[PDB]
Amino acid sequence: SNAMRIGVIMGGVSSEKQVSIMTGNEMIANLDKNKYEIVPITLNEKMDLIEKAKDIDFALLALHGKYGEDGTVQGTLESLGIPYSGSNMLSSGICMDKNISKKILRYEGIETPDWIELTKMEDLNFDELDKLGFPLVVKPNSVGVKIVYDKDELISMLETVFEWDSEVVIEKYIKGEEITCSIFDGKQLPIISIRHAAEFFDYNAKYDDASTIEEVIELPAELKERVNKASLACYKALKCSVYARVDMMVKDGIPYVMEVNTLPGMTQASLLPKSADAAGIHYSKLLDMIIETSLRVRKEEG
Amino acid sequence: AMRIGVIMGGVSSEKQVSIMTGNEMIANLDKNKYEIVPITLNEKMDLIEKAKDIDFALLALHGKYGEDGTVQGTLESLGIPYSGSNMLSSGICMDKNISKKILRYEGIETPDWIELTKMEDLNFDELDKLGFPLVVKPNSGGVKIVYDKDELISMLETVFEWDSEVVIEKYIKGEEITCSIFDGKQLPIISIRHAAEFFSTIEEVIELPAELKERVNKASLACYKALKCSVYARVDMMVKDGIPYVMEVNTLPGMTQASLLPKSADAAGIHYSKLLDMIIETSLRVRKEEG
Numbered sequence: 001s002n003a004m005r006i007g008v009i010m011g012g013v014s015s016e017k018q019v020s021i022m023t024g025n026e027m028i029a030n031l032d033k034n035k036y037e038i039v040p041i042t043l044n045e046k047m048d049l050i051e052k053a054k055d056i057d058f059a060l061l062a063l064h065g066k067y068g069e070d071g072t073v074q075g076t077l078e079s080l081g082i083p084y085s086g087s088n089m090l091s092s093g094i095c096m097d098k099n100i101s102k103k104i105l106r107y108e109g110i111e112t113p114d115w116i117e118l119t120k121m122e123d124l125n126f127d128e129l130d131k132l133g134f135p136l137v138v139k140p141n142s143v144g145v146k147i148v149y150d151k152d153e154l155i156s157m158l159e160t161v162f163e164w165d166s167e168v169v170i171e172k173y174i175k176g177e178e179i180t181c182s183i184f185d186g187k188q189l190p191i192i193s194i195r196h197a198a199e200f201f202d203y204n205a206k207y208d209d210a211s212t213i214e215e216v217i218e219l220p221a222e223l224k225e226r227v228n229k230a231s232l233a234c235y236k237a238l239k240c241s242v243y244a245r246v247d248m249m250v251k252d253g254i255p256y257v258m259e260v261n262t263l264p265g266m267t268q269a270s271l272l273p274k275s276a277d278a279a280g281i282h283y284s285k286l287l288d289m290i291i292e293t294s295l296r297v298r299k300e301e302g
Numbered sequence: 303a304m305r306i307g308v309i310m311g312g313v314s315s316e317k318q319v320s321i322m323t324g325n326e327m328i329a330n331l332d333k334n335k336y337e338i339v340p341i342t343l344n345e346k347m348d349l350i351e352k353a354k355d356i357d358f359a360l361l362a363l364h365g366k367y368g369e370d371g372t373v374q375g376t377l378e379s380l381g382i383p384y385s386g387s388n389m390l391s392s393g394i395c396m397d398k399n400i401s402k403k404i405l406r407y408e409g410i411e412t413p414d415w416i417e418l419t420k421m422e423d424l425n426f427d428e429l430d431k432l433g434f435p436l437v438v439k440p441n442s443g444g445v446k447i448v449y450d451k452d453e454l455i456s457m458l459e460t461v462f463e464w465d466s467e468v469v470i471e472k473y474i475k476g477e478e479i480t481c482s483i484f485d486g487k488q489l490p491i492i493s494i495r496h497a498a499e500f501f502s503t504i505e506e507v508i509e510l511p512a513e514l515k516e517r518v519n520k521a522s523l524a525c526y527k528a529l530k531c532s533v534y535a536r537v538d539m540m541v542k543d544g545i546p547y548v549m550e551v552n553t554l555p556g557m558t559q560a561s562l563l564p565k566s567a568d569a570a571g572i573h574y575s576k577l578l579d580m581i582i583e584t585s586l587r588v589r590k591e592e593g
């Protein structure tokens with residue numbers, strides 16, 4: 001039995017590169033050595049992939065952020081006829097574009113927060129802005145998401161963001177419970193709650209706003225059914241394959257989709273593998289399912 | 303003197319069109335402004351080696367090879383400015399299902415349709431909301447049309463060798479036109495008529511009635527924006543009862559002198575060599591706006 005040669009693809013620039021290295025190392029360390037011949041691939045520049053992938057049967061992506069999201073790596077691998085993990089080039093690019101992904105979701109009737117799309121030299125229509133109210137969340141579509149409380153803050157923040165990016169999403173702020181829903185091959189995994197830590201005095205909870213805890217949670221049946229329905233619908237709508245993670249906010253019992261991730265964290269401390277583990281899927285087996293399901297999917301694509 | 307790669311490639315019929323296109327470009331590119339660097343890709347990824355010799359990639363590509371976005375994404379990753387729409391726009395416009403959803407979300411008129419696959423099961427229900435006749439085309443790209451339930455079911459099986467995904471559209475019976483856009487400005491509209499014997503195909507610049515022209519110009523420009531196209535594009539439409547319908551948006555329209563976009567530009571007084579000058583100049587600006 002000749003072992004399939006798995007390239008573990010690492011790369012990116014700055015902190016993304018480091019997260020990528022850490023991810024690849026975990027994969028390399030947990031890949032079943034009897035099933036696979038493991039081939040670490042570290043990309044000094046993105047297009048070095050063409051040379052380094054000559055010796056692999058499959059590309060397992062350890063990438064993090066733009067390099068793995070924009071779709072170029074997937075498209076290159078496809079052009080080389082080399083099967084790879086996760087969503088394809090178009091699904092990846094769509095999911096990475098928050099504006100375009102929200103349009104498609106909203107077209108499909110999936111709840112997502114109201115928003116304005118704005119490009120760099122484009123003016124800003126204050127009548128539609130006012131419809132949104134304040135606070136607002138400014139999302140580059142290097143610089144992170146930021147809550148702004150009024151017109152002046154918004155203006156100032158647009159100017160900060162636009163120097164680096166040419167496009168922004170301005171989203172209505174929603175105060176609610178944050179959750180994230182991992183999907184593997186069209187099946188919903190355990191939901192994870194993301195909230196502040198509390199100190200409890202009897203039944204009074206005092207929250208620490210500087211903290212964040214992530215915990216697997218079972219939601220009440222009604223909301224659970226609604227959440228599972230929305231997340232799978234995102235998955236199909238955005239043409240995702242193999243696995244994805246949908247980030248949502250719940251208010252008044254209604255889930256809103258903030259984003260869909262085709263390249264979610266894959267370290268053992270990351271949300272998706274934590275969800276899989278709660279589902280009885282240990283890390284090494286999650287890696288087996290990704291390779292196995294990806295091969296099937298790349299074959300269905302031709 | 304700026305080094306311009308003329309990039310040609312593809313397989314089969316597409317490659318031939320590509321080489322034909324790149325030759326025309328090489329012939330008409332101003333020799334005083336440019337140093338022209340013919341580039342022919344045997345395999346797609348050979349682009350990486352050959353592109354170290356150039357300051358700009360002018361794409362002579364045709365069909366999926368230049369539509370899916372891999373070439374654009376590769377050149378972007380190499381830091382090499384290139385002509386036309388970027389990887390995301392290209393991929394979106396190549397996907398008829400996705401581009402239709404976005405257009406419709408934006409309130410742009412496009413024929414009613416449904417998405418279908420090899421994998422999935424034909425769903426009897428949704429078809430008959432569409433009625434007949436239907437037009438059947440692969441999702442990723444003459445006219446294949448079906449006048450009854452029987453031709454449809456069969457058509458799908460044959461096509462399904464072609465593509466894994468298919469779009470089924472309501473048949474729009476109308477006057478066919480095509481709208482070339484350059485850097486956000488509409489060029490003269492072209493009318494496309496068909497006759498077994500005229501009183502194959504005729505393409506001519508036609509001045510549309512003022513009102514229709516206005517709706518057409520609005521729709522074509524809205525597609526251009528909605529799909530994030532840049533530098534140039536060609537929107538193909540079907541007019542019925544004064545209402546324009548969008549059939550599709552092309553980020554890589556035919557670029558020969560005999561092709562529709564160059565003819566449209568010609569009708570505006572933009573000669574072939576100058577159209578290339580503008581493609582290069584405009585793309586350079588766009589690529590810089592993107593980062």
Ligand SMILES: Nc1ncnc2c1ncn2[C@@H]1O[C@H](COP(=O)(O)OP(=O)(O)OP(=O)(O)O)[C@@H](O)[C@H]1O
Nearest residue numbers: 113137139145171172173174175178247258259261
């Ligand atoms: N509309 C909103 N209302 C309230 N809080 C929000 C809203 N949008 C985002 N947030 C908070 O900001 C965080 C980050 O936003 P988001 O998930 O949309 O972008 P991202 O995760 O940074 O993008 P990427 O997928 O590139 O990592 C969310 O986890 C949530 O805590």
Ligand SMILES: Nc1ncnc2c1ncn2[C@@H]1O[C@H](COP(=O)(O)OP(=O)(O)OP(=O)(O)O)[C@@H](O)[C@H]1O
Nearest residue numbers: 413437439443444445471472473474478549550552
């Ligand atoms: N709904 C429709 N009703 C009537 N005629 C149509 C319809 N859709 C397409 N056609 C005809 O079929 C021809 C092909 O159009 P289509 O949109 O399928 O091109 P395409 O193959 O998607 O283009 P590309 O090569 O860029 O992928 C057109 O010339 C048009 O006349």
Ligand SMILES: [Ca+2]
Nearest residue numbers: 247258259261
């Ligand atoms: Ca997120």
Ligand SMILES: [Ca+2]
Nearest residue numbers: 538549550552
């Ligand atoms: Ca067409």
Ligand SMILES: [Ca+2]
Nearest residue numbers: 570571572573
């Ligand atoms: Ca002239």
